[PDB]
Amino acid sequence: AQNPNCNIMIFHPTKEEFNDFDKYIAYMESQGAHRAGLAKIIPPKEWKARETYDNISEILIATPLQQVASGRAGVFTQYHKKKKAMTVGEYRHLANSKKYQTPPHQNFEDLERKYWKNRIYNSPIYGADISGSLFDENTKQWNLGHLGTIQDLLEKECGVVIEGVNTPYLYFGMWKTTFAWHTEDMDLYSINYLHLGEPKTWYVVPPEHGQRLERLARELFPGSSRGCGAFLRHKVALISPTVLKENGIPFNRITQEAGEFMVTFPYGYHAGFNHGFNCAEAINFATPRWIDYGKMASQCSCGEARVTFSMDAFVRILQPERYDLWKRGQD
Ligand SMILES: O=C(O)CNC(=O)C(=O)O
Ligand SMILES: [Mg+2]
Ligand code: NI
Ligand SMILES: [Zn+2]
Numbered sequence: 001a002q003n004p005n006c007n008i009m010i011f012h013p014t015k016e017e018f019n020d021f022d023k024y025i026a027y028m029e030s031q032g033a034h035r036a037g038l039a040k041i042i043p044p045k046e047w048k049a050r051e052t053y054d055n056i057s058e059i060l061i062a063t064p065l066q067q068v069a070s071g072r073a074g075v076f077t078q079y080h081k082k083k084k085a086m087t088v089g090e091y092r093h094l095a096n097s098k099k100y101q102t103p104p105h106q107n108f109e110d111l112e113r114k115y116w117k118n119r120i121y122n123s124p125i126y127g128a129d130i131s132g133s134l135f136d137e138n139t140k141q142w143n144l145g146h147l148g149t150i151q152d153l154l155e156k157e158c159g160v161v162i163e164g165v166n167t168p169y170l171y172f173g174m175w176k177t178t179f180a181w182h183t184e185d186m187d188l189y190s191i192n193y194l195h196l197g198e199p200k201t202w203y204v205v206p207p208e209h210g211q212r213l214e215r216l217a218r219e220l221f222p223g224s225s226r227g228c229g230a231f232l233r234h235k236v237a238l239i240s241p242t243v244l245k246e247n248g249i250p251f252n253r254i255t256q257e258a259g260e261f262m263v264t265f266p267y268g269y270h271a272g273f274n275h276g277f278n279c280a281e282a283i284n285f286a287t288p289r290w291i292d293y294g295k296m297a298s299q300c301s302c303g304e305a306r307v308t309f310s311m312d313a314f315v316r317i318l319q320p321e322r323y324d325l326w327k328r329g330q331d
Contacts, residue, residue: 003032006206008039008252015044018141022148025189025263025287036252037268038204041261043142050136053196056279057089059170061127064091067178069120074240075220076120078178083125088172088279091127095174095277100124102175102198102276108255112201115273116240119176127172134170134195134281142261144168144193144283151310153286160317164310168283173200173274180235181213181271185307186314187297188284190264192256197278200256203241205269209250213239213269216247233300238271266293294318301329 003009009031013024024041033039065080086094094100105111133145140146149166175198184190194200205213214232218225221237228234244251256262258278264270266289286294295318299305312330316323 001032002030003035006035006037006208006250006252008036008204008254009033010040010042012042013044015046015141018044018047021142022287028263029289033263034265034268035206035208036204037206037265038202038252038254038270039263039265040254040256041142041263043259043261047139047141049139049143049193049195050134053134053279056134057087057092059088059130059132061086061088061091061130061172065126065128066123067126068123069238071120073117073120074243076238077221077224077236078180078238079236080126081123088127091125091172091174092277094125100174108199108201108275111275115176115201116242119178119273122176124174124176124178126174126177127170130170130172131167132170133168134279142193144191144281147191147283147285150188150284150286151313153288154291154314154317157288157291158317162313162317164313166284166310168281171280171282173197173278173280175274175276177274178238179270179272181217181232181237181239181269182235183210183232183267183269183297184264184284185311186318187267187293188286188290189266190282190284192262192264192280192282194256194258194260195279195281196258198274198276199258200272200274200278200280201253202256202262202270202272203244203251203253204264205249205251207265207267210267210269212249216244216249228300228302228304230298230300231302231304232269233298233305235305266290267297291318299326301325303329306330
């Protein structure tokens, strides 16, 4: 069995290996990368996502979100307070202001310590889930807006033809902006490219051990667990590495830098934070190996999780018994 310890693997494809996306995902899996839940891909030196970023300040963040925490430093939830629209240029200046800028620090480890100690006492502002792409149309390799669609994968594997589309999203972050513990919708893969700026730290639980994280989360957030049997789908709960280690939950951590891809694998729980002003692009995707995870994915039916148009068909085809209840929570 490859990668039995479930370590995060890092890959350095050559330019030739970077041509066929599906092939290279299958290669990483042959080496056991999926067992970690997360992999890093460093693009060949000959590759570029676009020529420059000198022209991005005019993008609009229609609904910036202020991430307000409740709880204790290691175990907290966050809610999103909507803020007035701002451009990327406005947001970058905000990020770099004295109130929001990254503090002085020695190294990534010192910054991680400061994050876990102090995050709850501040409310950073995140530009999330902005439909769009920063890949140049002429970039042919690993262009996140030109991937094979999940609808097409389900059609090829299962023969059924469904509605829905699959497009990328932009994320603009600052110091302390936070992604809560989650798996993807329908336990899909994700791929994330850090276009520019300061790093993103990731934490991940191996897919084979995801239910250990779920059990701890029910213990730590007991009212939330009573409200919903899949409340991690709400994407609001944070648990620190120190708390995970205290409770024996297997996990790994890694820091992504600008110019690097991360792939999350089906049912790989992940969480993290941004080090300072940055811009990432991400999208969900599927492979044949996903289909069994899609069929077994938990679902939120309490109303809170509310998701895209395209998840309807996934539930309807893969999970017909659950469909009527889930759709009630959509409506
Ligand atoms: O970058 C973020 O804020 C969160 N991204 C992801 O959860 C991802 O790519 O799957
Ligand atoms: Mg612009
Ligand atoms: Ni994710
Ligand atoms: Zn719910």
